[PDB]
Amino acid sequence: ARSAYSYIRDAWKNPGDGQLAELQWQRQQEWRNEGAVERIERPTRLDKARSQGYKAKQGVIVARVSVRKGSARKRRHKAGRRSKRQGVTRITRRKDIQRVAEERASRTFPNLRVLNSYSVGQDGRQKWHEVILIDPNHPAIQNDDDLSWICADDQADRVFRGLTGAGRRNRGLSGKGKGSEKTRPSLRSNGGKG
Amino acid sequence: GKKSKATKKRLAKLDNQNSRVPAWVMLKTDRRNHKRRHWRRNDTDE
Amino acid sequence: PVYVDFDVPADLEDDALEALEVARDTGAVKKGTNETTKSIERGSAELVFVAEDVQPEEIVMHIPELADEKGVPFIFVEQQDDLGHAAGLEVGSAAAAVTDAGEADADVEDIADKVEELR
Amino acid sequence: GRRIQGQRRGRGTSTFRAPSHRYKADLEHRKVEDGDVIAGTVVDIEHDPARSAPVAAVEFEDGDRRLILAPEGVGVGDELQVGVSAEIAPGNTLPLAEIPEGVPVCNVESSPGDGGKFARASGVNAQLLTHDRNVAVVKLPSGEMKRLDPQCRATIGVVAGGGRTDKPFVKAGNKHHKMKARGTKWPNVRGVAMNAVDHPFGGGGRQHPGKPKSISRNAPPGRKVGDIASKRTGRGG
RNA sequence: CGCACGGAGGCGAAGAACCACAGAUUUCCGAAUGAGAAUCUCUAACAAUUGCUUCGCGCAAUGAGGAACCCCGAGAACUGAAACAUCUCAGUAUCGGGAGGAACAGAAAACGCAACGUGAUGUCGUUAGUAACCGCGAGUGAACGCGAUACAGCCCAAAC
RNA sequence: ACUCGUACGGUCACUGAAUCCUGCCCAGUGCAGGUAUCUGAACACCUCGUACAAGAGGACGAAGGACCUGUCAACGGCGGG
RNA sequence: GCUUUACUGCAGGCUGUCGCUGAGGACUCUCACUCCGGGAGGAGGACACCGAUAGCCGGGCA
Ligand SMILES: [Cl-]
Ligand SMILES: [Cl-]
Ligand SMILES: [Cl-]
Ligand SMILES: [K+]
Ligand SMILES: [Mg+2]
Ligand SMILES: [Mg+2]
Ligand SMILES: [Mg+2]
Ligand SMILES: [Mg+2]
Ligand SMILES: [Mg+2]
Ligand SMILES: [Mg+2]
Ligand SMILES: [Mg+2]
Ligand SMILES: [Mg+2]
Ligand SMILES: [Mg+2]
Ligand SMILES: [Mg+2]
Ligand SMILES: [Mg+2]
Ligand SMILES: [Mg+2]
Ligand SMILES: [Mg+2]
Ligand SMILES: [Mg+2]
Ligand SMILES: [Mg+2]
Ligand SMILES: [Mg+2]
Ligand SMILES: [Mg+2]
Ligand SMILES: [Mg+2]
Ligand code: NA
Ligand code: NA
Ligand code: NA
Ligand code: NA
Ligand code: NA
Ligand code: NA
Ligand code: NA
Ligand code: NA
Ligand code: NA
Ligand code: NA
Ligand code: NA
Ligand code: NA
Ligand SMILES: [Sr+2]
Ligand SMILES: [Sr+2]
Ligand SMILES: [Sr+2]
Ligand SMILES: [Sr+2]
Ligand SMILES: [Sr+2]
Ligand SMILES: [Sr+2]
Ligand SMILES: [Sr+2]
Ligand SMILES: [Sr+2]
Ligand SMILES: [Sr+2]
Numbered sequence: 001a002r003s004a005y006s007y008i009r010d011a012w013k014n015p016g017d018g019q020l021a022e023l024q025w026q027r028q029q030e031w032r033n034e035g036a037v038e039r040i041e042r043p044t045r046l047d048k049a050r051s052q053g054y055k056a057k058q059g060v061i062v063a064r065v066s067v068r069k070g071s072a073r074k075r076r077h078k079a080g081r082r083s084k085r086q087g088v089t090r091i092t093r094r095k096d097i098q099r100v101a102e103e104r105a106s107r108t109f110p111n112l113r114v115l116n117s118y119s120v121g122q123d124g125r126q127k128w129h130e131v132i133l134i135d136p137n138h139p140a141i142q143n144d145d146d147l148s149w150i151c152a153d154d155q156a157d158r159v160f161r162g163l164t165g166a167g168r169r170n171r172g173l174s175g176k177g178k179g180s181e182k183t184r185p186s187l188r189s190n191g192g193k194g
Numbered sequence: 195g196k197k198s199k200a201t202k203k204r205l206a207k208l209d210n211q212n213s214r215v216p217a218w219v220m221l222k223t224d225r226r227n228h229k230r231r232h233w234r235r236n237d238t239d240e
Numbered sequence: 241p242v243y244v245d246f247d248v249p250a251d252l253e254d255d256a257l258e259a260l261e262v263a264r265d266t267g268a269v270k271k272g273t274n275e276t277t278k279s280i281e282r283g284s285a286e287l288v289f290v291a292e293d294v295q296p297e298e299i300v301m302h303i304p305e306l307a308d309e310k311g312v313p314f315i316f317v318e319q320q321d322d323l324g325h326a327a328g329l330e331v332g333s334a335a336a337a338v339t340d341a342g343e344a345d346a347d348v349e350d351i352a353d354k355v356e357e358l359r
Numbered sequence: 360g361r362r363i364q365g366q367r368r369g370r371g372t373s374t375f376r377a378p379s380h381r382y383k384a385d386l387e388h389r390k391v392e393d394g395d396v397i398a399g400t401v402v403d404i405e406h407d408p409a410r411s412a413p414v415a416a417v418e419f420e421d422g423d424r425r426l427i428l429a430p431e432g433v434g435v436g437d438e439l440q441v442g443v444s445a446e447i448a449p450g451n452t453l454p455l456a457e458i459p460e461g462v463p464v465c466n467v468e469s470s471p472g473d474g475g476k477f478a479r480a481s482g483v484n485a486q487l488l489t490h491d492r493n494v495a496v497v498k499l500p501s502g503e504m505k506r507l508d509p510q511c512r513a514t515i516g517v518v519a520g521g522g523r524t525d526k527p528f529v530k531a532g533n534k535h536h537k538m539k540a541r542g543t544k545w546p547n548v549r550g551v552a553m554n555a556v557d558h559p560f561g562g563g564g565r566q567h568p569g570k571p572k573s574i575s576r577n578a579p580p581g582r583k584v585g586d587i588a589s590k591r592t593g594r595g596g
Numbered sequence: 597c598g599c600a601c602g603g604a605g606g607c608g609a610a611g612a613a614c615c616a617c618a619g620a621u622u623u624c625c626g627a628a629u630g631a632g633a634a635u636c637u638c639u640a641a642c643a644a645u646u647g648c649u650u651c652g653c654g655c656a657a658u659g660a661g662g663a664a665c666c667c668c669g670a671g672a673a674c675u676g677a678a679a680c681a682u683c684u685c686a687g688u689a690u691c692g693g694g695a696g697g698a699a700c701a702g703a704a705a706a707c708g709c710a711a712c713g714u715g716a717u718g719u720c721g722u723u724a725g726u727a728a729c730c731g732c733g734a735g736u737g738a739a740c741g742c743g744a745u746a747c748a749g750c751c752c753a754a755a756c
Numbered sequence: 757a758c759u760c761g762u763a764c765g766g767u768c769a770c771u772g773a774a775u776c777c778u779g780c781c782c783a784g785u786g787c788a789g790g791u792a793u794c795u796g797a798a799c800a801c802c803u804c805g806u807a808c809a810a811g812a813g814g815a816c817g818a819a820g821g822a823c824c825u826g827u828c829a830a831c832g833g834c835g836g837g
Numbered sequence: 838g839c840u841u842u843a844c845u846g847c848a849g850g851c852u853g854u855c856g857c858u859g860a861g862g863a864c865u866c867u868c869a870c871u872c873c874g875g876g877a878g879g880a881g882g883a884c885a886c887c888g889a890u891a892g893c894c895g896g897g898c899a
Contacts, residue, residue, distance in 0.1 A: 082845095375758075376757065481764045592830050
């Protein structure tokens with residue numbers, strides 16, 4: 001039958017209706033007063049967490065990040081940068097907020113590696129994401145048959161090289177066919193036209 | 195000006211590098227110190 | 241808190257937890273929010289326990305309404321780890337279920353009643 | 360062109376900042392839980408660099424030493440009181456309500472508890488007019504009717520040092536010295552005496568702004584100079 | 597008994613020189629980490645940030661370097677268009693972050709020679725200056741397929 | 757930043773000690789204020805259109821503008837017959 | 838380099854609208870949110886702030 005999990009999930013399908021609506025209105029007040037990276041004992045969205053790879057083990061950390069909202073905060077132009085080149089309040093950046101989050105998080109934890117992240121709400125001027133990080137040095141995880149992969153030296157700073165799932169989903173790598181000619185196998189490998 | 199202990203050791207070394215190529219090297223090599231620094235004409239770091 | 245709609249008197253809770261310990265040592269019980277859930281869905285639940293000190297509240301939010309559309313009676317427990325120890329576990333639990341009591345059916349019966357009276 | 364002087368200002372560089380390190384105190388209303396059992400005695404009457412007005416040094420019943428904005432009158436040896444029950448004499452401080460209508464007050468709080476905001480200049484003074492269980496209308500030195508929460512504390516009497524504005528500086532030197540102790544750049548070069556590249560009014564083969572001086576409120580910094588959103592100009596008419 | 601053929605002297609048949617490997621020693625500054633400092637000084641140090649935790653720095657991690665390569669971000673102008681704004685130069689130069697001996701990609705919500713067809717991924721040859729774009733100007737410009745290289749497929753979440 | 761500041765303040769401009777004075781002009785331009793009426797984008801909204809969408813018309817209508825007033829120690833003007 | 842009622846744009850100010858945003862064409866409210874207060878608590882209040890968009894102005898700038 002339905003798993004208790006499928007309930008948490010089925011609820012966040014519309015974080016603005018019912019109990020969850022009352023929760024967020026409350027939590028946020030507390031959230032809005034927390035740092036920019038708060039570690040938390042348990043994931044707010046359990047289904048999602050586990051689903052994304054979470055495990056109630058040793059070395060599996062969760063942290064809620066809070067990034068300022070908006071689009072782009074771009075200066076005008078020092079020298080003589082023409083019209084098509086005067087970006088300031090009408091353009092946005094090529095990296096989505098969740099990626100910014102994942103990064104700030106991994107920095108706060110200079111030894112942990114990003115596993116994944118999820119949204120947990122957003123008031124009128126900031127977005128919150130919980131990021132699942134992992135200690136590649138705790139044997140507790142070095143042994144785990146489902147997570148020991150995140151230990152390869154070539155997984156170091158995996159988030160800063162866009163290896164997160166959201167990382168890849170942003171580098172235009174979702175589709176295996178049409179419209180991904182300039183993305184895969186690498187944006188840089190494609191003279192950045194993706 | 196006041197010189198520190200290091201600033202001194204250095205100035206010391208620098209003064210020493212200012213010696214001539216010992217007579218014997220001339221012979222042992224059958225034939226010039228390209229680093230002769232004069233207190234007036236040249237200039238040391240710091 | 242958001243899933244709680246009535247406070248269960250210190251005394252009443254005690255009884256509930258007391259009954260639970262003999263429930264494991266007689267009939268049967270489910271330990272864990274997930275196990276508790278299915279039981280309510282399968283109907284094989286007579287009395288379900290839900291901790292009040294849970295966070296994220298997500299985990300349990302559903303219980304109160306799912307048990308109401310399944311008749312199954314339920315009771316709140318101020319603290320999480322007590323329910324865990326009351327179900328005989330090293331690490332506290334957020335929700336437990338009394339799957340067919342045992343030499344407690346008399347109590348359960350009343351407790352379930354005592355709460356109905358508690359609105 | 361280049362940024363104009365007004366734009367350089369904002370940057371907050373030395374030249375533009377005020378010699379704060381040479382300033383005495385942030386004159387604010389002492390605090391009392393409530394009641395009124397607070398009153399010290401005037402120990403000194405000093406000169407505050409930041410305002411060119413006099414400021415009294417008061418010592419309280421508890422042994423607290425703090426400078427207070429000196430209203431005309433307050434001499435040394437005198438005792439002033441602070442609180443809701445504080446006697447209604449020149450120098451003492453108490454919420455607007457407790458103050459009898461038609462009485463000149465200075466150093467008036469905008470938000471009850473801020474510590475004084477209005478009327479603090481030399482010889483200036485506010486006037487308490489209307490009283491209510493809600494609002495306490497006060498006429499400020501500019502002649503404006505400022506409705507205030509009766510809980511806003513104020514001091515009784517005009518700010519000492521009045522009339523300073525009545526004697527002409529006579530010479531730049533004097534002006535120079537005053538300025539040297541204020542967050543102000545000096546002297547003042549006229550916009551029209553500058554190069555086009557330096558100011559909206561610069562350039563030309565003779566001084567004269569090449570535009571009407573009254574500028575739109577919406578003007579952007581760098582362009583907003585001369586008569587800002589003037590509702591009119593000239594003396595007559 | 598270095599470059600480096602001198603003087604004096606010394607070492608080597610106790611097998612030196614010399615070479616390969618492994619080891620010892622390895623001052624101070626230096627990521628530089630007890631604190632400060634133009635390589636020195638002052639009175640026990642994983643400083644700072646983290647994970648685990650006997651909650652004790654007890655056990656661990658990070659930091660910085662490297663010719664270029666690689667990956668993720670930020671992102672010009674000269675110039676071309678015989679001027680010039682879109683366009684071009686060009687996602688080039690330059691900057692910020694990060695990994696490895698290779699990186700990235702990768703086992704289809706694919707393809708669509710529409711089929712009774714193919715069957716992860718890079719890459720090379722071609723497809724092709726084709727389709728497509730574009731003050732439809734100057735210019736820009738793929739893919740499926742094919743021939744090759746190499747080939748290798750798997751693990752969770754949930755149900756129980 | 758101004759600001760340990762508060763209209764006897766400080767900001768932005770002009771003229772340039774004292775003394776005697778500082779005329780007329782608000783049409784244009786600027787600034788400011790008002791405004792029946794008119795004009796005035798997008799969203800939501802009505803009608804039609806499309807099994808949806810592109811779309812057609814309507815409706816309401818902000819600042820702004822029209823329009824009206826104030827202002828020249830505001831840009832400036834002070835002729836011909 | 839500089840100017841402007843040259844061309845084209847951008848900051849920026851003004852304004853409508855959408856989100857933040859809640860309870861009962863004019864209104865009440867308090868609970869988010871903002872400000873004052875050491876605090877208790879006070880003021881303000883779904884406005885303001887901020888994200889987005891739309892119209893006007895826009896040599897301050899390119
Ligand atoms: Cl990472
Ligand atoms: Cl002055
Ligand atoms: Cl095929
Ligand atoms: K160009
Ligand atoms: Mg010598
Ligand atoms: Mg003060
Ligand atoms: Mg003056
Ligand atoms: Mg000065
Ligand atoms: Mg001048
Ligand atoms: Mg000049
Ligand atoms: Mg100019
Ligand atoms: Mg002149
Ligand atoms: Mg003049
Ligand atoms: Mg050190
Ligand atoms: Mg050209
Ligand atoms: Mg490649
Ligand atoms: Mg042409
Ligand atoms: Mg191109
Ligand atoms: Mg294709
Ligand atoms: Mg002159
Ligand atoms: Mg504050
Ligand atoms: Mg220009
Ligand atoms: Na890290
Ligand atoms: Na693209
Ligand atoms: Na010298
Ligand atoms: Na060595
Ligand atoms: Na270390
Ligand atoms: Na420790
Ligand atoms: Na040309
Ligand atoms: Na040219
Ligand atoms: Na073009
Ligand atoms: Na006129
Ligand atoms: Na004239
Ligand atoms: Na020039
Ligand atoms: Sr690293
Ligand atoms: Sr010399
Ligand atoms: Sr626990
Ligand atoms: Sr204060
Ligand atoms: Sr103050
Ligand atoms: Sr001029
Ligand atoms: Sr006149
Ligand atoms: Sr294959
Ligand atoms: Sr006029």
